[PDB]
Symmetry: D2
């Protein structure tokens, strides 16, 4: 079984050894990171099934993100397998503040009346919490009495009971027991804060990521096609046109403008953590099925994320609901499933990846019986798409071990992946950027190979590479597609059914 559903694993201190000290150990942050040992841990995750690593710029500074990115490069060499590099931005969001005098939280216990400051560039006291609003907007006039301020994915709730004009402070009452922690999302539902289409912090973080070398950018809180277009401009201006942009849909505006966002973007990341707070929690499942169907229909990449194996942050086994959620996401038709704290911050990062790989592999087996996606309803809008439909027909007609595509830019691979064929898809490409770029497409196994010359037999190369990759053996039937001949073909125009020597 080759795992068709791709895994995005968020990296962080959990797999990072510093000075021989593990995450949570006293004096850990004071130490310098141990690159080779940290690299070996990451390589296990690669071998376990991680197809792309996510670097959340919401937390670590550029030195932290850059060193972690460098470590993944050694991990690829240790593993002998390449992975995608994905950058997740802060976005038009609100996040929290530090405490005075050595405090890191207050036993925020239910029923008390306390305060949240709107004054920007400051820090907190037990009776008054400061919002490090991204950039430095003043939201005092945007929030009315009766609004709710939620801290840490909604773990703790604050009701605005009054507004103090003298200090520009909200007087709030704790609705339940919880923890106030730095760089924590703060959600204030039903609130129209006018944040910028692209904040300078995001612009700078993206440029830093582009200099390091990344393949994908996940843009937090995309509200319109404009949020995508601004990032696209930076990628094109810097000569990084190959970078794919995944819009993060996490609010009503992103949902209202979904069709326009899908058209501008290369894919969607269903950011359920913020979405379930910004919109009614009971509507997220409805939106998730609908987003997956729409993104697939557009031949784009969809990632399901947040709380998928949440319990695995503290325990070696996930809950029944967590396994069900990962299984259903695959059935709904997701290209990829994602791990956040489970891989970044948890006690069982490798176990979380292996557990997700096992469920994803089991669920792929039931796509024929229970799968929601319907390739039969699609309009075939181009000759390459007609070929992708034909390949899917071959995989339905007989037992096909592998579909091989010789693709220059990955277009043929994306269309074949879009059709969800009953076969793994080996994408033979001629450059590292195209190869890494296909890593989140459902069922695609990207493989680097020499660009073919006019005198080469591309069918022979496809069989040779598939055999080298260990994906096929003598007697197996494979479907191979290419644009023949090289140098005259305008597009993928040929389908061959071949029995492996």
């Amino acid at each position: 079984m080759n795992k068709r559903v791709k895994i995005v694993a968020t990296l962080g201190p959990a797999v990072e050894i510093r000075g021989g000290k593990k995450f949570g150990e006293d004096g850990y942050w004071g130490e310098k990171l141990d690159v080779e040992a940290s690299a070996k841990n990451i390589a296990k995750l690669i071998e376990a099934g991680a197809n792309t690593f996510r670097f959340n710029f919401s937390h670590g500074d550029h030195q932290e993100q850059g060193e972690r990115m460098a470590t993944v490069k050694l991990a690829e060499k240790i593993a002998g397998k390449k992975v995608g590099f994905l950058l997740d931005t802060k976005g038009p969001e609100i996040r929290t503040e530090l405490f005075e005098g050595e405090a890191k939280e207050y036993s925020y216990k239910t029923g008390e009346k306390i305060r949240v400051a709107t004054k920007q560039g400051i820090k907190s006291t037990r009776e008054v919490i400061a919002l490090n609003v991204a950039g430095a907007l003043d939201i005092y006039d945007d929030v009315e009495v009766g609004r709710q301020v939620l801290v840490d994915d909604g773990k703790l709730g604050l009701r605005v009971v009054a507004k103090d004009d003298a200090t520009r402070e909200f007087e709030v009452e704790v609705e339940n027991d919880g923890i106030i922690a730095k760089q924590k999302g703060v959600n204030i539902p039903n609130t129209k804060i006018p944040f910028p289409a692209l904040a300078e912090r995001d612009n700078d973080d993206i440029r830093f990521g582009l200099e390091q070398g990344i393949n994908f950018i996940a843009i937090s809180f995309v509200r319109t096609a404009k949020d995508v277009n601004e990032v696209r401009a930076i990628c094109e201006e810097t000569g990084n046109g190959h970078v794919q942009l995944f819009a993060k849909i996490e609010n009503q505006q992103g949902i209202d403008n979904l069709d326009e966002i899908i058209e501008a973007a290369d894919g969607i990341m269903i950011a359920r953590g913020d979405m379930g707070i910004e919109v009614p929690f009971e509507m997220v499942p409805v939106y998730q099925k609908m987003i997956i169907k729409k993104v697939n229909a557009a031949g784009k990449v969809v990632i399901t994320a947040t709380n998928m194996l949440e319990t695995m942050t503290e325990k070696p086994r996930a809950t029944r609901s967590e396994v069900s959620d990962v299984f259903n996401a695959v059935i709904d038709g997701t290209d990829a499933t994602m791990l956040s704290g489970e891989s970044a911050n948890g006690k069982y990062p490798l176990e979380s990846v292996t557990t997700m790989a096992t469920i994803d592999k089991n669920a792929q087996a039931l796509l024929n019986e229970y799968g929601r996606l319907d390739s039969d309803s699609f309009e075939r809008n181009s000759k390459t798409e007609v070929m992708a439909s034909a390949v899917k027909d071959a995989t339905s007609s007989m037992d096909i071990k592998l579909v091989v595509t010789l693709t220059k830019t990955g277009h043929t691979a994306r269309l074949i992946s879009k059709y969800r064929p009953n076969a793994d898809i080996l994408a033979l490409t001629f450059d590292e950027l195209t190869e890494r770029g296909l890593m989140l497409n459902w069922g695609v196994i990207p493989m680097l190979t020499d660009a073919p010359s006019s005198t080469d037999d591309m069918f022979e190369i496809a069989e040779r590479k598939a055999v080298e990759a260990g994906l096929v053996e003598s007697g197996d039937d494979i479907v191979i597609v290419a644009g023949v001949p090289v140098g005259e073909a305008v597009r993928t125009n040929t389908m061959r059914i071949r029995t492996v020597r």
Copy 2:
């Protein structure tokens, strides 16, 4: 519009000029046939849409059949188009006898009591009719009182009211007004006459046809797989293995043994004239839909025949029921529609072919909306069949002007035809026997071409031949299939989508 449904046209005196005298003219039979003029008439029928000519050995002697066959050869040269040659046998049947003293019929008017002789090798009187039973069986003991003797496709009915042992004669009463004519089918329903699996007259007629050069044999009254196998043995023994055998299903036994007959045969001819008398007339439509579905499922050829444009024997326009029957046969999924008396014996032979071509062409347009055949339900049982399914998918995905196959034996063409693609199928073949052999397959346009060498580009040849044939123009999209490379491919393994220069 290229006519996908093939037409089988029975030849006869109607298009044959003898001594400058037309059929029906006094002294016509006494004259010698005019080959070139007769050839020009046949060429018009070829141009009108006849894809195969049927020679009924039930009527004319070997000199008549042989000269007619020779005339069709000149017609192909005049027309510039080749047609199939089909031989129809007498079979385990009963046919009628000559009258004494210059009489050719008696105004057989209803209610009289008269006689039918069983004595073989004799001739008739108004009060006593002789049965020229094929070969010379004695059926006197096979027919009981109360049985019905029907003459000329059931046009006239005789009820057996008594049996005279002294003369071995049946005493019958005329049930209705009609004509007793020579070499007329005589049906005696619910009668178990034990005729031979292969009569000597049939064996001799088939050998004569094989010496002349034929592509198909329609075997009258096939009751079991054995009837087909006996003919198959003669074809193989004489070096005529290329000949295809169409079983004629015209009785309950043929219907009971249909699955075995289909397996032994290359196709079925639904001989409705005898079938509608041998079995309840109201069941023929049920059998017709079922036979077409079964033969198509087997990738074999099905021909619907008898009374299709019957009125056109005497009038220039068919009845509403005749047009409906031809239209429905195409909708049911027939490969071919047939003309008997309309082309052989009628006053409007060319008009009958043109009328059938018009209805068949109109009906092909409604196959997507009303067509009974369902390719989706078929098991794809071989790699060439998987390719045929893939070609059908391409024709459904986008507008394909033509499907081209380079086929050595016609196997790929038959499987593509089986799938009923929304396109004409140009079958490029390397010998005349394969070319003529594909003439009754739905949508197949056979074309002769040089056998390809290892250095040829078969895709270029396919486009060149299609353009030469006038079937495609610049900008048209075509699907081309072949076994590449020539000399190493085991079978059709390649599908190419090409835009015509």
Copy 3:
């Protein structure tokens, strides 16, 4: 088996005995009608399955039509079975005139030269054929040289070769051997004769028919809804609002206006004879399938007509194409099939009804497997229609012997019939007009009963009537619908599943 598909039989001299003489015997016309002997012949057609008799006013005169209708009333008493009475109007048509002297017809040969008069109010001679043009129009200026004049369903073709202005006569050449009989329909394709809105002759014929007592009117050549509305006004004005109007679609204008025509009418008669000459003959099958689907969707009645068993006019058995046509019309979804010359003019009127009943009964058995109609796609537009859908669901769920509806106006029966349930429909109604009115609805067995009182058990009456009818026996399962209770119910609101005691 009960025959679900209804039969319309055209009456004429064929079933009539004159002074102990049959049609086709010398001096037949000079003898008075043997009413009782003629009535006995008609009762046999009723017993054989004719559900309605058609009186073609294009033929003969009011006395002949009135006498024939009285004979049918006698035949209903002799058979103990009621039938519908249908009047077929002349419409905006051209008919050949009576001939001077004794002649009823003349035979013509290909190439003969004759004339066609345009002068109205005169009789034909063999050499000069006169026309009865609706509205007494002069068509001389409407017909150019080169136009074709066709006689009797296009059986005989006449070519206009010259025009004589002195006599306003067309000089024509006979194109094929044929007959020109008195009162035969004349078609002049590609001409635009300006026929009137409603000819006075049609107003007279309709008023005469309503006075005799009829249940249906088939309006010839309906061009627009106004043609239906004019007839509707006469039916309403005379207190004959119960009469149902079947628009005859026989020209391009009717096809073009089909939706408005269906909306105005109670049903459609597919008048294939004129339609096949008025429009390309190959399109009639396309139009037939489409009309049947549209009329059924509208919950109205569709009759397929002309040439269904044409050969049975002269012979005891129909052709294979004729049997195919009747079977396919049932499969297409027709409520009724019709006989014209076969029952009015032929040698086998009773046999023709019996043969059609046999084919129709066999075809009904294949509706589940091959039926074109799809009740699943219908919008249920009213509470009675929702009950009709529920009744069909019951018939699909289990073996239902009979559906019984207690209907004051037949609306519930029409809706149940629209749904094509897998059961016979016993329509218990309280007046003879409603009873005769349902005779052409698919599967409906109309039965007269006393109107139920508010103290009656309608479920018990339904079982008793079905049992007395011999339709069901002990242990049979039946579905019964009614509006309960009587006097409070505004519509059929109840469905009962009952086992026969």
Copy 4:
């Protein structure tokens, strides 16, 4: 919106007030139960949508269970709403023992070494954990070194590293940080402990529960139909034949024997907590979808259980995966969803019921678009089932506000519920046992009414009861089913479509 998907809420100390003290407050257990205050808390859960309360006999003792059941009877009076009573048996299971002294639990760290006693009838200490094995079995010889002992739904893992024959103790190493609380389920995968047919403890617990008055029994670890039959015998013997048995499928033996188990039982509880440890965790989603389809096909009840809103035990909002799990269970076709620790042990019992009701209500709205269940494939095996199919057809055909069934035993309501109609189902029944008995059927609103006499208008009563319920208003369309007339009817035989006055 009425919540069609039923909720089972496990009761416990969480909703209980002891001497004016809440769960999670010092000295709570040393205070007498405040019955009235506890009853008021429970009434809120009833108001929020709990349809049945679950009493887990694996926990506490008969006095605690009996007192809790009495409090629920009080809560039913306070809410003016009735709920079902469900008893959950211990079954052939292993549970941790009570601890010596005050301790209810102990915390353990990874790598700690402790022992597990096999001796029965003793209490645990922190260093030596004792087990209550069903049937008081000695499992020492059944467990080898290297086996894993899991505690509390597999939350804590223990590895057997040595066996001490002197004390019959297992030496184990703690594999992950976790807690060992009293009376927690213990799983030892890949072992075959020979549990008895029905433990005497289960016989006692069931008899005690039946005496209190219960409507349902969930049988833990059903291995075969015999497990169901033994409980059934006790219910029947005691005159409690009305009690429904839900087999809990939580091991491979139950999965293997599912068809026989479903046949013996009234329903199935998908006990995912034990099932996820007993079988590969990735297979639970496959088994869940399959069990729901099979139970629904059988016209029986299916409950999905465990970890549905697990995070709500400690927090006010559930995770994204938890919400996905509840939504998917409804989409899969579950009759009911369940709360365990969330309602019995957590800080947010009322909120947990409210959150589940909200998700269940939203999910019901997407059943038309995404529902897995397909009533179209069912065989209608009886006349009442045919009526149920017809009712669903009515709800599909038009906007039906409510379906009302007058059912003596609830059979008609079960059949209507099986069909998943697009409407609420008001079940009018004549006894409280039938009424409580229908509380877990999908979409059924059970309502007590007087048994109708033969002079009563059942249709009028149905409308009046629906109106008094506030379920319908003037102009609403309702479908009513009944067996009419009362005293002659052997089953529901009538369907009425009625508009509310």
